[PDB]
Design a protein around this ligand. Structure first.
Ligand SMILES: C=CC(=O)Nc1cc(Oc2ccccc2OCCn2ccc(=O)[nH]c2=O)c(C)c2cc(C#N)ccc12
Lengths: 551, 403
């Protein structure tokens, strides 16, 4: 049976076929292998070969607790076979499908065994059925079709199925045919009767090419449980998420937990996973017990509250607009919904990455819009309209003053607190009448001891001692000291490019508590101007604090 | 043209396997039309799953018709070298760039090498497997196409070069660079003569520069009627920054004016010694640097800074603080511009100048988020080549110094 063209297959350059010896088997397994192999030989899937085939691959027989299954271990051959065009790794997302009036699942029976294998390659699939106690030579076989477990079977089967479907699809443009592994998914808007007729036509075509489909009425009806999804006629959702309850948690338990939460976040709005991944920050052995943080406990509890209610998503309509909304979830965490109709979400999602030690709400919002843009291009092939809780003044000021280039989509402001805002803004010019603090900090790089001090133009000077610190942290601590001992308006002069860079970025959240305290001080201020001078240049003001903090 | 040039890869190197980027339905449809017509013309052919190689493709505009752009950067990295750049091209008064890539579609590609040109038209939402092709002819954007076509190009250009000995012609990838010192009308007339000469010999050619005005920008210092303490601090910081490049800069007399602990807004009169020192420092910055020289073995690096109000500074160097070139790019707003458009145009201009001066593209350090650039860089890309790039994540605390 070779109406299907074979795909030319080569071994990796410089490699020969596998010669793995056959493990001895029990008499019952040998009997099962003999009967199965005679049935396959009648069907043309395998052929007995002469004695001059030097290659061999181990064979096995098992029955998972009635039917017997033959299994072949192609690990060596797979190591020795060429690479293929990568079979589809990413599955479609259910929110990208268009609602169909009639829908059908066709499971292809014995898919791989229905496609012929390249002739010149068949010799490398040789295997041996062992004789009883090695009295006589075992039986030598080789495959004529795509073996189950071989490296090239999925890609070659998919290609062959595509070429087989091309004519039928050409004669039926009103029928949508998807292929995935050994499954076909057929959809149409025709009448249910003539839809069944078209399904029967496709079944007869595939059968003419040697591919069997569900002979009776097809065993699979809605809802379809597929890859952790429930696919209903008018909606889709995820299969039920079950979060474990444990006294102690290992790295593995937390990894699977954040995995299930990630999986739920695509339709359940409000899922948070930041504190638990913070528990995974150590990244050590999978059996190491990790103690849960209070924030992780609260996070998991809120997630349990969210997963208590059932949620579902709808399918896509190309004639309606695509809309995305973003809401702030708290400390650096964001949630979003993508929909076409007000309360019918296509899907949901989250964004909680800092991608840096410090950031602000506007930057994170822009990054979330970026992620939604990429996901929308992937799933629907277009970018959505954005409804965002930020005003044009805030965002325009930010992206205008931002040193880095950014792409701002078209969006309408939706007044739904909490709104995204600039908690503070540094001054662009020095402040008249405000006290000028010259600040400096230093630390002994061996003893880790240090100090932070200031000298002002009013004649005020101060030094505060510090233990277990570094020079950069003493620079930040000096800025903080100036903020603490100043009025509502203050000019600050520093020689640290590190601290200057941290403050100029204008963050409103940080991983270090010192920068958080500086942020609170800045929010409580009215006007703050920060200036920089090169160190050890005798500028004046800076030299006094340098000599003061060095002494 | 039956005889194909045998092409190899560098020893111990396999073909490219680069991820295809997701595209909108518009670009996918455009690529399907383009690739269907190219397939009817025998330029590309469909391939089976025994081909594991891949090269990304994109759709651009360059006109209202869509154009196909192939990112052969990886294949170019992995392709064998083939058996020059004139230094006088940058001295010419006018240089015009002509697209001669269509000619490459007249030459067949080595049959054993075609599998390495494989590319994929992606599907939306991974619903169907992508449409996979390979090239049967020399493709545009591959470094082997101008090398294999080089003899034919020399043969076609030989008469025109004979008539015009003082006109410089340098080829880079799909582009011909034609430079002359003639008047602009004479120059454009010669360009049209070359165009018609190429056309009547079957070389279809469906942007003129002036490198005579290019230069390394000098460091500029402020001029003020009244200086504050903050202003003098800025000036001393900038002069201290420039002292790494220029040796003779002095700040002693200028910093002397700030002795004490003064308020930032206090007005400070420029004394005689500080004003003469600032003037001397202005004269020092008029000269170019001493020992900066180009190394053909080292990579070219281009840095860009966003200056606001549509202004972007850039530096091309090979070693830090050894700027081979510096420049400032500007664009009239018109309420139709944005950061990504200006940055893309800047990258293309910098790359063009780099090709004219040194004959290769630089490595870009782009002040943008990776995914944003990867999302929108094709919307304004008009060139046929693609340079290497990375993404800086630290703000330049020197934006004001190059400003
Ligand atoms: C992410 C990909 C995805 O979910 N692919 C799938 C698509 C599909 O049907 C369609 C076939 C052609 C065009 C659109 C289709 O569905 C549109 C939406 N839809 C879904 C269900 C339903 O009853 N009615 C309805 O309109 C079916 C029957 C699938 C069955 C399995 C199983 N097992 C797995 C995946 C399937």
């Amino acid at each position: 049976i070779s109406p299907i063209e074979t795909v030319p297959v080569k071994l990796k350059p410089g490699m020969d076929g596998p010669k793995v010896k056959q493990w001895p088997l029990t008499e019952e397994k040998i009997k099962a292998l003999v009967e199965i192999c005679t049935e396959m030989e009648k069907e043309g899937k395998i052929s007995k070969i002469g004695p001059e085939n030097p290659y061999n691959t181990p064979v096995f027989a098992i029955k998972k607790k009635t039917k017997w299954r033959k299994l072949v271990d192609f690990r060596e051959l797979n190591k020795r076979t060429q690479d293929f065009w990568e079979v589809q790794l990413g599955i479609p997302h259910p929110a990208g499908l268009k609602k169909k009036k009639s829908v059908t699942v066709l499971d292809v029976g014995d898919a791989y065994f229905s496609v012929p294998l390249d002739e010149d390659f068949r010799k490398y699939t040789a295997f041996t059925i062992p004789s009883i106690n090695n009295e006589t030579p075992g039986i030598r076989y080789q495959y004529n079709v795509l073996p189950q477990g071989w490296k090239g079977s999925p890609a070659i089967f998919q290609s062959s199925m595509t070429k087989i479907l091309e004519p039928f699809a050409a004669q039926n443009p009103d029928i949508v045919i998807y292929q995935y592994m050994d499954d076909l998914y057929v959809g149409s808007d025709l009448e249910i009767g003539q839809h069944r007729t078209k399904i029967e036509e496709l079944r007869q075509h595939l059968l003419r090419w040697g591919l069997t489909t569900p002979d009776k009425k097809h065993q699979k009806e809605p809802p379809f449980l597929w890859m952790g999804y429930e696919l209903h006629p008018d909606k889709w959702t995820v299969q039920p998420i079950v979060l474990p309850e444990k006294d102690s948690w290992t790295v593995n338990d937390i990894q699977k937990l954040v995995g299930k939460l990630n999986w739920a976040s695509q339709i359940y709005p409000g899922i948070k996973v930041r504190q638990l991944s913070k528990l995974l920050r150590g990244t050590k052995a999978l059996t190491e017990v990790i103690p849960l943080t209070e924030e992780a406990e609260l996070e998991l509890a809120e997630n349990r509250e969210i997963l208590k209610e059932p949620v579902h998503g709808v399918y896509y309509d190309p004639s309606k607009d695509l809309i995305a909304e973003i809401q702030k979830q708290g400390q650096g965490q964001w949630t979003y919904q993508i929909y076409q109709e007000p309360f019918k979400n296509l899907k949901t999602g989250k964004y909680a990455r800092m991608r840096g030690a410090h950031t602000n709400d506007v930057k994170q919002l822009t990054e979330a819009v970026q992620k939604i843009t990429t996901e929308s291009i992937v799933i629907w092939g277009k970018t959505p309209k954005f409804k965002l809780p930020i005003q044009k003044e805030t965002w325009e000021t930010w992206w205008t003053e931002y040193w880095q280039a950014t792409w701002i989509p078209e969006w309408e402001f939706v007044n739904t607190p909490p709104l995204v805002k600039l908690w503070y803004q540094l001054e662009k010019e020095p402040i008249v009448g405000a006290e000028t603090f010259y600040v400096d900090g230093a630390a002994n790089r061996e003893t880790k001891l240090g100090k932070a001090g200031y000298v002002t133009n009013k004649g005020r000077q101060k030094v505060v001692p510090l233990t277990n610190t570094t020079n950069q942290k003493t620079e930040l601590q000096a800025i903080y000291l100036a903020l603490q001992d100043s009025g509502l308006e203050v000019n600050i002069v520093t020689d640290s490019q590190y601290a200057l860079g941290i403050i100029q970025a204008q963050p409103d959240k940080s991983e270090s508590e010192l920068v958080n305290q500086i942020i609170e001080q800045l929010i409580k201020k009215e006007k703050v101007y920060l200036a920089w001078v090169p160190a050890h240049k005798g500028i004046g003001g800076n030299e006094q604090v340098d000599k003061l903090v060095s002494a | 043209p039956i005889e194909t040039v045998p092409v190899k890869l560098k020893p111990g190197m396999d073909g490219p396997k680069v991820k295809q980027w997701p595209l909108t339905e518009e670009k996918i449809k455009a690529l399907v039309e383009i690739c269907t017509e190219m397939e009817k013309e025998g330029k590309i052919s469909k391939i089976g799953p025994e081909n594991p190689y891949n090269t990304p493709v994109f759709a651009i505009k360059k006109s209202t018709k869509w154009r196909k752009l192939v990112d052969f950067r990886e294949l170019n990295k992995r392709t064998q070298d083939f058996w020059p750049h004139p230094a006088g091209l940058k001295k010419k008064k006018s240089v015009t760039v002509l697209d001669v890539g269509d000619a490459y579609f007249s030459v067949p590609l080595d049959e054993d090498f075609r599998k390495y040109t494989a590319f994929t038209i992606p599907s939306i939402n991974n619903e169907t497997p992508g449409i996979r092709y390979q090239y049967n002819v020399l493709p545009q954007g591959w470094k082997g196409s101008p090398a294999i076509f080089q003899s034919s190009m020399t043969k076609i250009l030989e008469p025109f070069k004979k008539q015009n000995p003082d006109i410089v012609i340098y080829q880079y990838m799909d582009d011909l660079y034609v430079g002359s010192d003639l008047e602009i009308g004479q120059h454009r007339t010669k360009i049209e003569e070359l165009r018609q000469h190429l056309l009547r010999w079957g070389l279809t050619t469906p942007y003129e520069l002036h490198p005579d005005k290019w230069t390394v920008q000098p460091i500029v210092l402020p001029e003020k009627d009244s200086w504050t303490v903050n202003d003098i601090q800025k000036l001393v910081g900038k002069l201290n920054w420039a002292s790494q490049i220029y040796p003779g800069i002095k700040v002693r007399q200028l910093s002397k004016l700030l002795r004490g602990t003064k308020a930032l807004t206090e007005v400070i009169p420029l004394t005689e010694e500080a004003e003469l020192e600032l003037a001397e420092n202005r004269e020092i910055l008029k000269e170019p640097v001493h020992g900066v020289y180009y190394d053909p073995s080292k990579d070219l690096i281009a840095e860009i800074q966003k200056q606001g109000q549509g202004q972007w500074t850039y530096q091309i160097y090979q070693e830090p603080f050894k700027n081979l070139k510096t420049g400032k790019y500007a664009r009239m707003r018109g309420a139709h511009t944005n950061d990504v458009k200006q940055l893309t145009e800047a990258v293309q201009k910098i790359t063009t100048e780099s090709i004219v001066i040194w004959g290769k593209t630089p490595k870009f350090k782009l002040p943008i988020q990776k995914e944003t650039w990867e999302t929108w860089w094709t919307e304004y890309w008009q060139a046929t080549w693609i340079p290497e790039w990375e993404f800086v994540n630290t703000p330049p605390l020197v934006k004001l110094w190059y400003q």
